Ligand binder design. Structure first.
Ligand SMILES: *C(=O)[C@@H](NC(=O)/C(=N\OC)c1csc(N)n1)[C@@H]1N=C(C(=O)O)C(=C)CS1
Length: 261
């Protein structure tokens, strides 16, 4: 079976819908599966919000250290870092780190509020040439992941292209690019997702997402030991609202598409 056959078979066995885009930066080749179809991003959208703040910081040397007050009323469904800082402050940099490395939903909301709302995140994506990304809601409602709902969606290929631009390319100034990469590499939430399908010693930066409809996502940049980087988006969603999330499917997809590399 070819790689395409392998992916189709994975989806068939999955009980849902799998979206994969891998970009091999060695030769600009791609491994694409439903890559122009829309999926709910869930918390993978946090990369775009953090990057939008990094872009602003290029032209404001005080931005990343700007204090943001954290209140009990800011707490939502999942906020392991922000809850430690109630009655105190976190900087915008600390909010970026918490959003990306712990998937702190309060931190995401502070980034969105700072930027001026979800539509400002969409505008930032558009500024990078991403015609597909849209952010419509704050956390946690951006994770409803209802089949066919266009809110808070993108396609695997659009997200792979933009993640490449953000981390390895044309989107950010060098210090800010490096900061985004540092954040992604230090993610704590991705052990069982793309990372689990790769050689243990490969360096990886990623951002996960999980939502309703068993929606289970991960977006990654991967640095092999002897090869150019790979950029990989694995999105997965299921037909029933209360389906279990399935990080194992993402690991399995990663293993399939990184074979040989
Ligand atoms: C991002 O995806 C976000 N997900 C949620 O807050 C969830 N629902 O909001 C309606 C959700 C659905 S299933 C589940 N576990 N959480 C955060 N993302 C993750 C992640 O896996 O990246 C988390 C660690 C914290 S919650």
């Amino acid at each position: 079976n070819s790689v395409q056959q392998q992916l189709e078979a994975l989806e068939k066995s999955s009980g849902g819908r799998l979206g994969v885009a891998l970009i091999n930066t060695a030769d600009n080749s791609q491994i694409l599966y439903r890559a122009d179809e829309r999926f709910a991003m869930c918390s993978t959208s946090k990369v775009m919000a953090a990057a939008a703040v990094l872009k602003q910081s290029e032209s404001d040397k005080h931005l990343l250290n700007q204090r943001v007050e954290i209140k009990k009323s800011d707490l939502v469904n999942y906020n392991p870092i922000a809850e430690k800082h109630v009655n105190g402050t976190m900087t915008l940099a600390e909010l970026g780190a918490a959003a990306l490395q712990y998937s702190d939903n309060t931190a995401m909301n502070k980034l969105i509020a700072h930027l001026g709302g979800p539509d400002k995140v969409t505008a930032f994506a558009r500024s990078l040439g991403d015609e597909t990304f849209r952010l419509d809601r704050t956390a946690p409602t951006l994770n409803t992941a209802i089949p066919g709902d266009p809110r808070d969606t993108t396609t695997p290929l659009a997200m792979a292209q933009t993640l490449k631009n953000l981390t390895l390319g044309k989107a950010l100034a060098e210090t800010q690019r490096a900061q985004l990469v540092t954040w992604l590499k230090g993610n704590t939430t991705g052990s069982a997702s793309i990372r689990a399908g790769l050689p243990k010693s490969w360096v990886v930066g990623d951002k996960t997402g999980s939502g309703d409809y068993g929606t289970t996502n991960d977006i990654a940049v991967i640095w092999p030991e002897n090869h150019a980087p790979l950029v990989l988006v694995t999105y997965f969603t299921q037909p029933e609202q209360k389906a279990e999330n399935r990080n194992d499917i993402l690991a399995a997809a990663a293993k399939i598409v990184t074979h040989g590399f």
